[PDB]
């Protein structure tokens, strides 16, 4: 397995079994040493204040978050960021249906859009009550992050001056979203509570509630 | 006046899965050192030790059946027991139904067995050396 790259002669098959045995002993000791280290007790790359939640946003009850949010922060979110799995994938409608009006009273949004669903995002979040404002453009090849705002950002909380909208890849030929955007937020809201939907373990930064099926 | 270190634990208790945060509320870094879907919960290590008494060392297929409802990895059982028996090769122990109290003795006796002959690594006695 694969059946065609495998040997069929006895001399070829015995030789291969002999080398696999040696190799299982090798990856055995690497797995004991891995588990023991993890066991007693290694530290992950995750910051301590991060707040992961593995759930499916269709199945997830947002009210459980809403209530536990008010219970602890005393306020709804300041900044919400998204990277919808456009159509592993979610029907364009499903994400549209998500109750993101409930989730934030006054603050910003950040939605990542590919050229194919660029227009869709605008009317997706104008539905969410957000007012389209600004576009952050990422150069790797282009991907656009659309920004919106509802209610009042007049409060002193937010900082009007913006880190330059443009942004670059931390590495060359990279596919994960770049970290700088988490400091754009940090300039825009320092130590503000933030939500990320469609998060990923490498999107785990502290101060951030991250919801993702892959967390 | 919003304490984020307390706000983090206070959220993790009410929203995060049982695997992500300790009832303490702090973060369970053991969970992120293993890929998503291949983490080994403690409710799984007790499920295995239990399987050794009812089905013995060799019958992984049968154990995965009763304790893990057919979802666990036969080879991850095959290895996690080596760590229970502190030995790299468990061919000797094939088919022996071993009580949970006999396992620690078998581990301690194989660790100490390992320690003496300097054939011990990573709390595991390597009776097979390549």
């Amino acid at each position: 397995d694969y059946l065609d790259r495998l040997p069929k002669s006895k001399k070829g098959l015995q030789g291969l079994l002999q080398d696999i045995e040696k190799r299982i002993l090798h990856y055995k000791q690497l797995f004991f040493k891995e588990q023991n280290e993890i066991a007693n007790g290694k530290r992950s790359m995750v910051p301590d204040n991060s707040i992961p939640i593995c759930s499916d946003v269709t199945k997830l009850n947002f009210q459980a978050l809403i209530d536990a949010q008010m219970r602890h922060a005393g306020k709804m979110f300041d900044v919400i960021m998204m990277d919808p799995p456009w159509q592993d994938s979610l029907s364009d409608e499903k994400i549209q249906n998500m109750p993101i009006q409930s989730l934030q009273q006054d603050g910003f949004i950040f939605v990542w859009a590919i050229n194919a669903k660029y227009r869709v995002t605008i009317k997706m979040i104008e539905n969410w009550g957000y007012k389209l404002v600004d576009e952050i453009t990422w150069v790797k090849a282009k991907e656009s992050c659309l920004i919106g705002v509802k209610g009042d950002v007049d409060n002193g909380r937010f900082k009007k001056n913006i880190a330059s909208d443009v942004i670059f890849s931390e590495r060359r030929g990279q596919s994960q979203k770049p970290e700088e955007i988490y400091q754009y937020i940090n300039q825009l809201c320092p130590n503000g509570n933030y939500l990320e939907i469609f998060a990923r373990r490498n999107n785990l930064h502290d101060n951030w509630v991250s919801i993702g099926n892959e967390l | 006046p919003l304490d984020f270190t307390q706000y983090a634990k206070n959220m993790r208790k009410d929203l995060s899965n049982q695997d992500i945060c300790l009832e303490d509320g702090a973060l369970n870094h053991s969970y992120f050192l293993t890929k998503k879907g291949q983490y080994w919960t403690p409710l799984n290590q007790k499920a295995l030790q239990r399987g050794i008494e009812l089905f013995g060392v060799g019958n992984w297929k049968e154990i995965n059946y009763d304790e893990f409802s057919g979802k666990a990895n036969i080879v991850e059982l095959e290895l996690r027991t080596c760590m229970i028996l502190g030995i790299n090769d468990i061919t000797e122990y094939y088919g022996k139904k071993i009580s949970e109290e006999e396992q620690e003795e078998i581990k301690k006796s194989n660790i100490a067995k390992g320690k003496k002959e300097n054939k011990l690594k990573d709390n595991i006695y390597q009776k097979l050396q390549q």
Binding site: - | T34, N73, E76
Partner: peptide
């Protein structure tokens, strides 16, 4: 990139297939 577990899984499954062809003879 693979993990240590995933590699051991391929290795065991491979071992089973070859042991099957070694027995088929």
């Amino acid at each position: 990139k693979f993990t240590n577990l995933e590699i051991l899984t391929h290795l065991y499954n491979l071992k089973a297939e070859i042991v099957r062809r070694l027995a088929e003879q």
